[PDB]
Amino acid sequence: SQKNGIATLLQAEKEAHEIVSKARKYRQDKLKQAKTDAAKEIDSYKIQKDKELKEF
Amino acid sequence: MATALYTANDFILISLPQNAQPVTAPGSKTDSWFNETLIGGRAFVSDFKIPEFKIGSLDTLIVESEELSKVDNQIGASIGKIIEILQGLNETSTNAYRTLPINNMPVPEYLENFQWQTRKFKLDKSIKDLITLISNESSQLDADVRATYANYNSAKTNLAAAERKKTG
Amino acid sequence: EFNIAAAIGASVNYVTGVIARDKVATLEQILWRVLRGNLFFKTVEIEQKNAFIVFSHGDLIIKRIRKIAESLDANLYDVDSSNEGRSQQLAKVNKNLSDLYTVLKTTSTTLES
Amino acid sequence: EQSLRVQLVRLAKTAYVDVFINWFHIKALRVYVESVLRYGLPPHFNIKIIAVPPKNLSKCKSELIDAFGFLGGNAFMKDKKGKINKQDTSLHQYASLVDTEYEPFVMYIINL
Amino acid sequence: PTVQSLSERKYSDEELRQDISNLKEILENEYQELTSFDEYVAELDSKLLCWSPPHVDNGFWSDNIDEFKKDNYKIFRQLIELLQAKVRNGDVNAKQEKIIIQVALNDITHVVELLPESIDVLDKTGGKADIMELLNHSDSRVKYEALKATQAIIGYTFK
Amino acid sequence: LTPNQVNDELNKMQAFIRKEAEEKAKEIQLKADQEYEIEKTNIVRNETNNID
């Protein structure tokens, strides 16, 4: 069992690297998801101010 | 020994995991093996469970052992300098100044109730700020003791200089 | 080998190096195991005089292992050969070792003549 | 000299008590970080301090080193009464930051 | 060489030492007075390679290396294509191809040993394969120049 | 030492590396959600200020 522990430790290290890459891809997806979820807020206030300008 | 201990004894701090077992008694507990399996049956066990910490990364754990070893060596050198100043002051008694009973109790009873109690250290910050605050407090206490010991030595030298002029 | 499993890309980090005594590798494995956690290995390979050592550690502590490995009387690095721009580097090292033998043979024949 | 002796005695006593508490907290933090870093899995272990009598620490350290030496290694664990460590030439290391010979398990010595 | 060796072993007459010392300064400064870029571009463009006093210096290839680099080392690729094209058409063991092969191997060895970026032009062009085969042939002086040119590119591969 | 203990140490080393990677992934996973709502709130505040 010389290469079996290196193979299981290599698979566990690949699972830990995939677990770290899932968190890094989750934070990188959330970084664009903050602006993607924040860019839609102006579309309601612009029409809400356009209603107040259309009243006058 | 019998020249450095008058109210306290020798202690050994060791930690083992939950799956560890001894090689001389397989199939027993480490808690019952600590007292019952001790040499002569007179070994006393004291609780030293501190609070749990959160590891930030694996890279800081390697430098944390060297920083804790250097801070432990600086704390031991500061305790040796404070003991050297207390022995140099000519006020150490046969029991006090060589045992250091904290809280007016023995070292085994105080060490058995030691649960990582702090007065300015909380369980929400990192261990590096607590070790840096403890090293800064130990360096401030050692510098405060050395600053008074230097003025006491200069005052004793001036008192010996005035005593030599007063008569001789 | 310790088939392509470590010279063609993997998730684990290996530390290969030549040493003339196994006691320095045992003391380096004891110092690395006592001061850096379970981030060591135990391998032994006979060579032509030096002994082949086999060490394994994490991929984020390769910089700290160079100072402890260099200060422990050893040259355990990430790659022994200077050819690592492809998979595997032993194919290019076999070509450089296949041309350096002919250049050294021609230089030895011209120097002897 | 009298006031500096009294204030140096009180500040030496308070600084000795705070240095002793900081030394005990640093020893507990280093003892927890040593078994936590060297052990790995699991992240929880039982840490305690055993009070031994005077002149009998070699038997408790020899029995605890012989009993708990299987965790560090079968070839590195050896029977030692005191603190058996590397003290040879600079090819071998002996220190608190770089050493090539230590105890068979996580164990520290705290004495006054 | 006869003027340089004759300058140390002078005669009793001062006219012979003044004539050899006067001719040695004009003979030494005559080859050094020309530009290395015009001499290397004229010798490479003329298709006639020959040895000179300023052609065996590494400063000429280092000075003309930056000026020659205008098409990804097209000048060194043209010289290596002239040496390899002379090696293919007009094979070795000849009198004409041996001087251009030796001068192209010495200049290619000095230019290859000067900068480490010219090794890609030899592998991309294809003249690096003929350099290893040219060492095992006759003309062992040119085989030593090609051995030094192959050792210069072989030195940058493994350190 | 013995070759049998190398797999037992390598398993605990791999488990500790997996625990450290899970802790780092939880730290980054808390940091990204820690910053994203503040960035979206700042962009929404700037957009409302321009709309006003």
Instruction: Determine whether the interchain pair F19/D41 forms a contact, defined as Cβ–Cβ distance below 8 Å.
Output: yes
Look up residue D27 and give its two tokens: 């020893």
Query: Which uninterrupted H or E stretch holds C46?
Result: strand C44-46
* Residues spanned by the domain of B118: 50-168
Contacts of E59 (CB under 8 A, 6+ apart): E36
Q: Do chains B and A touch (3 or more CB pairs under 8 A)?
A: no
Q: Mark B43-60 as b/e (b = at least 16 C-beta within 10 Å).
A: bbebebebeeeebbebee
User: How would DSSP label each residue in E39-101?
Assistant: HHHHHHHHT-----SSTT-HHHHHHHHHHH-SSSSHHHHHHHHHHHHHHHSS-SS-SHHHHHH
CA distance E64 to B151: 75
d(CA C51, CA C74) in angstroms, rounded, equals: 11
Structural domain of E46: 38-157
CB contact under 8 A, F5 and D76: no
Query: What gap in Å lies between CA E65 and CA E58, rounded to an integer?
Result: 10
Query: Is the link from the previous residue into D42 a cis peptide, with omega within 30 of 0?
Result: yes
- Looking at the DSSP bridge assignments, the partners of residue B10 are D52
Decide if A5 contacts F6 (C-beta within 8 A): yes
Question: Which technique was the structure solved with, according to the deposited record?
Answer: cryo-EM
| DSSP string across B81-114 | HHHHHHHHTT---SSTTTS--TTSS-HHHHHHT-
Q: What's the CATH number where D104 sits?
A: 3.30.70.1180
Q: Of A13, A14, A24, which to mutate for an interface test with C (greatest number of C Cβ within 10 Å)?
A: A13
Question: CA D36 to CA D45: how far, in whole Å?
Answer: 8
Buried b (16+ CB within 10 A) or exposed e, D38-75: bbbbebebbbbbbbbbeebbebbbebbbbbbbbbbbee
Residue E126: φ, ψ to 5°? 115, 10
Question: What does the alpha-carbon distance between residue E38 and residue E43 come to, in Å, rounded to a whole number?
Answer: 8
Give the separation between CA B137 and CA B131, rounded to whole angstroms.
Answer: 10
Residues making up chain B, counted from first to last = 168
Chain C residues inside the 8 Å CB shell of A7: 5
Q: Which residues contact C102 (CB under 8 A, 6 or more apart)?
A: E132, E135, E136
- Find where tokens 């930051």 sit: D97
- Neighbors of chain D with 3 or more C-beta pairs under 8 Å: B, C, F
Cβ separation A9–F6 shorter than 8 A: no
Closest CA relative to residue C16, chosen from C85, C75, C67 = C75
Q: Which of residues 94-113 of C touch B (CB under 8 A)?
A: none
B18 touches chain F (CB under 8 A): no
Q: How far apart are CA F52 and CA A45, in angstroms?
A: 9
Interface probe, candidates E109, E130, E158, chain C, greatest C C-beta count within 10 A = E158
Judge whether C56 is closer than 8 Å to chain A, CB to CB. Answer: yes
Quick check: C12 contacting A, CB < 8 Å?
A: yes
By the 8 A CB rule, do B146 and B85 touch?
A: yes
Beta-carbon separation of B23 and D21 below 8 A: no
The domain that holds E45 is classified in CATH as: 1.25.40.150
Q: Do B85 and D8 touch (CB under 8 A)?
A: yes
* Angstrom distance (rounded) from CA D73 to CA F1: 7
Least Cα separation, residue B39 to chain C (angstroms): 27
Residue of F2, F11, F13, F18 to mutate for C, most C C-beta atoms under 10 A = F13
* Residue whose C-alpha is closest to residue E151's, from F12, C100, B145, B6: C100
> Which CATH number belongs to the domain containing residue B84 in this structure?
1.20.1460.10
Report helix, strand or coil for B65.
helix
For residues B6 and B42, give the distance between their C-alpha atoms in angstroms, rounded to a whole number: 19
Nearest CA in chain B to F13: B58
- Which structural domain, as residue segments, surrounds residue D90? 43-112
- Closest among B157, B150, B120, B114 to B137, alpha carbons compared: B120
The answer to whether the Cβ–Cβ distance between D76 and F19 falls below 8 Å is: no
